[PDB]
Each structure stands twice: as structure tokens, then as C-alpha cells.
A paper describes a structure:
Kustd1711 is a putative electron transfer protein encoded on the nitrite oxidoreductase (nxr) gene cluster of anaerobic ammonium-oxidizing (anammox) bacteria and consists of two heme-containing domains and one additional domain. Here, we describe a diheme cytochrome c with high heme redox potentials of about +350 mV, despite having a large overall negative charge, which typically reduces redox potentials. High-resolution crystal structures, spectroelectrochemical measurements, and high-end computational methods show how this is achieved: each heme iron has a calcium cation positioned next to it at a distance of only 6.9 Å, raising their redox potentials by several hundred millivolts through electrostatic interaction. We suggest that this has evolved to provide the protein with a high redox potential despite its large negative surface charge, which it likely requires for interactions with redox partners.
In our 1.75 Å resolution crystal structure, a glycerol molecule from the cryoprotectant binds in between the two hemes. We therefore collected data from a crystal cryoprotected in PEG 1000, which showed that without glycerol, the space between the two hemes is occupied by the side chain of Arg70, but that the structure was otherwise unchanged. As the data from this crystal were of lower quality, we performed all analyses using the 1.75 Å resolution data from the crystal cryoprotected with glycerol. Importantly, in our theoretical calculations of redox potentials (see later), the presence or absence of the glycerol or the Arg70 side chain between the heme groups did not affect the results by more than a few millivolts.
Residue numbers in the entry: 39 to 316
The structure:
């Protein structure tokens, strides 16, 4: 579809998967990444701060090297879309760049095209295929995921296609977005990345009772937290009137000992399951 901003808009809201994480003002509802309304103008500001040549160069860097600069308030969750699974072609990334420049600015197609030699070609990805050291299947991993008899049951906290229970984020479709490496890190190092909105907060009530957990809901009169302990979850409803302090923290309520609770086989099975959630 070429390299125009109109083509980039279809890709951003389509095969580029950008809108599964990024909203744009009132269009879309995703929150894993920042709202991209006015991105073009704050790209100029980032480029100034980071000593880059132009806002566009910052936009390029944000795609080709998402880890190189991490927007305040977010963790290293953005994938390299020219790598699997997304495997976004080079012409499509050039189009997306044109769309990003349109978010509060004007696309500059000549200037975008000079960056073509910096955009990796998806077909030429260097990522090695994922081959687990054991034969496992996604179906086997689905069984593990929802197995209430185990010492950890992903389904107690995650929903997939209407099955499971909501504590952490819904995992439907994450296999089309994320890498096996991200699944490994998510399972064995759960606080390395905290999905936006699923932070733990420390609450102290006026009476001096502590509650530490994630926010399920937040009304004018009630704060409902989900607490975790030894793989179990429980809700507490805290009157807003009685809250003395509330501080966000960097621990995830996802258990930190899953490497002790899953076998090697179960672990690689679950990963095959996540990869399959397209
Ligand atoms: C969820 C897994 C995401 C995907 C899919 C996309 N993005 Fe993303 N992006 C995400 C986060 C959490 C952040 C902030 C952390 C960081 O890496 O800086 C970003 C950031 C950007 C930016 C910079 C925004 C800024 O305010 O400076 C850009 C320009 C950007 N992302 C572009 C972008 C594109 C074009 C995507 C589809 C090809 C895309 N992102 C997907 C999370 C996620
Ligand atoms: C409740 C006590 C949980 C259990 C049991 C499991 N997970 Fe979890 N997970 C939970 C939360 C609150 C979050 C968000 C905060 C964070 O740690 O990032 C997550 C996150 C994930 C992710 C990242 C999702 C994303 O959108 O990027 C993954 C891939 C994930 N969790 C996988 C996973 C697996 C495979 C589990 C069973 C072995 C599992 N989780 C259990 C809370 C809880
Ligand atoms: Ca970045
Ligand atoms: Ca995590
Ligand atoms: Ca009140
Ligand atoms: Ca706890
Ligand atoms: Ca209790």
C-alpha cells in the first residue's frame, strides 16, 4: 500500500499491532503504551533532550530500538516489530513513520525515505527460531494454564477467550505481539516489566491498617484491591474516606516463584500456549 500516512494509519490500527498498546486520544482504548496524540510535537522535544537530529530520528529509533529510550512511567514491553512474531515489512514501517509524523505534525516522505537503510527487513531477521529443549504443544500448555491442581494456575489471574479469571491483563492475542523471550521473562521475572495499570499499591488506612495489592476498581467511595498470598487472591474493599496514603510500587502481584512451581515440561508447554494466542 506504499509509504503514505494513509497507508501507515491502516498498519498502525492493523497488522502493525501498534493500537493493541497505543491509543490516540479518544480513538482506541489500549493502555500498555502511551497515548500517541500529539506524538509528532513531543518527538521534537525528545530529540532535543536526547541530542538526536530531528523528531523523526527519535520516531525511527523508537521502532528500531524500543529499549534505547524508555518513556517515563513505562517499562520495556514494546517489541521490535520487524522481528517475529509481528514481522512488519520495511515498507510498512516507513508508512507507519509517515502516520506518526501526522499526529500533530506534517509527514515528510523524502526525509522518511532516507532512513530506509536503518530499518531492518523482517524477512532478514536474525532472531533464532524458538525450539524448546523438549517436545511440547500449545494444547499441552493450555491444560497447564488452567490446571487448578497445580501450585500455580495462570487461569486464576488471566483470561483467554472468555476462560479464566481477571486479575492480571487478558492474554488473548498476545502470541501475535510478544516474543517467547518476553514470555520467559514475564513468567520467571514478573516484576521486570509491570503492565501499565497493574501496579501494586501500598495503602495505609487512617486506623493504620496496611493493604498491598493491585487496584481492581476505584470509585468515588470505594477502593477495591486484589491481594495475593501464596498463589491465592482475595479482594478487599477499602472506603475512600478511610485511606490515609497510597503509593505505587514496582512489585507485581504475579507470583515470583513460578520457576519453583512448574516443571521444565510444564514451563515450556505454557510458553508454547502463549505463542499460539493469535
Ligand atoms: C505493546 C506491547 C506495544 C506495542 C505493540 C507498541 N508499542 Fe510503542 N510503546 C509501548 C510502550 C510501553 C512505550 C513506552 C516505552 C518505550 O519503549 O519508550 C512505547 C513507546 C513508543 C513510542 C515513543 C512514544 C513517546 O511518547 O516518546 C513510539 C513512537 C512508539 N512506541 C511507536 C509504536 C509503533 C509505531 C508501534 C506499532 C508498529 C508500537 N509502538 C507498538 C508499547 C507498545
Ligand atoms: C495472579 C496471582 C497471577 C498469576 C497466578 C499469574 N499471573 Fe501473570 N500477571 C499477573 C499480573 C497482575 C500481571 C500484570 C503485572 C505484570 O507482572 O506485568 C501479569 C502479567 C503477565 C504477562 C504479561 C502480560 C502482557 O500483557 O504483557 C504474562 C505473559 C503473564 N502474566 C503470564 C502468566 C503465566 C503464563 C501464568 C501462569 C504460569 C501467570 N501469568 C500467572 C498476575 C498473575
Ligand atoms: Ca522506547
Ligand atoms: Ca510482568
Ligand atoms: Ca466520600
Ligand atoms: Ca501480597
Ligand atoms: Ca486475608
Amino acid at each position: 500500500t506504499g509509504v503514505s500516512a494513509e497507508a501507515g494509519e491502516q498498519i498502525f490500527w492493523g497488522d502493525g499491532q501498534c493500537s493493541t498498546c497505543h491509543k490516540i486520544g479518544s480513538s482506541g482504548s489500549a493502555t500498555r503504551g502511551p497515548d500517541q496524540e500529539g506524538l509528532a510535537e513531543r518527538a521534537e522535544e525528545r530529540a532535543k533532550e536526547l541530542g538526536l537530529s530531528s523528531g523523526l530520528e527519535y520516531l525511527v529509533e523508537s521502532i528500531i530500538d524500543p529499549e534505547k529510550y524508555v518513556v517515563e512511567g513505562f517499562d520495556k514491553i514494546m517489541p521490535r516489530v520487524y522481528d517475529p512474531p509481528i514481522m512488519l515489512s520495511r515498507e510498512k514501517i516507513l508508512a507507519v513513520l509517515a502516520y506518526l509524523q501526522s499526529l500533530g505534525g506534517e509527514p515528510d516522505l523524502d526525509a522518511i525515505m532516507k532512513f530506509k537503510d536503518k530499518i531492518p527487513e523482517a524477512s532478514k531477521t536474525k532472531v533464532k527460531p524458538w525450539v524448546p529443549p523438549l517436545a511440547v504443544t500449545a494444547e499441552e500448555g493450555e491444560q497447564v494454564f488452567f490446571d487448578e491442581s497445580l501450585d500455580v494456575t495462570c487461569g486464576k489471574c488471566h483470561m483467554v477467550n472468555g476462560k479464566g479469571q481477571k486479575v492480571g491483563p487478558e492474554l488473548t492475542g498476545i502470541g501475535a505481539i510478544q516474543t517467547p523471550q518476553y514470555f520467559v521473562e514475564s513468567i520467571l521475572e514478573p516484576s521486570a516489566v509491570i503492565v501499565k495499570g497493574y501496579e501494586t499499591v501500598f495503602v495505609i488506612t487512617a486506623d493504620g491498617i496496611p493493604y498491598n495489592g493491585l487496584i481492581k476498581s476505584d470509585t468515588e467511595e470505594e477502593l477495591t484491591l486484589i491481594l495475593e498470598e501464596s498463589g491465592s487472591v482475595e479482594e478487599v474493599v477499602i472506603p475512600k474516606d478511610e485511606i490515609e496514603d497510597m503509593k505505587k510500587q514496582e512489585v507485581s502481584i504475579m507470583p515470583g516463584n513460578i520457576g519453583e512451581l512448574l516443571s521444565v515440561r510444564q514451563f515450556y508447554a505454557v510458553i508454547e500456549y502463549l505463542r499460539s494466542l493469535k
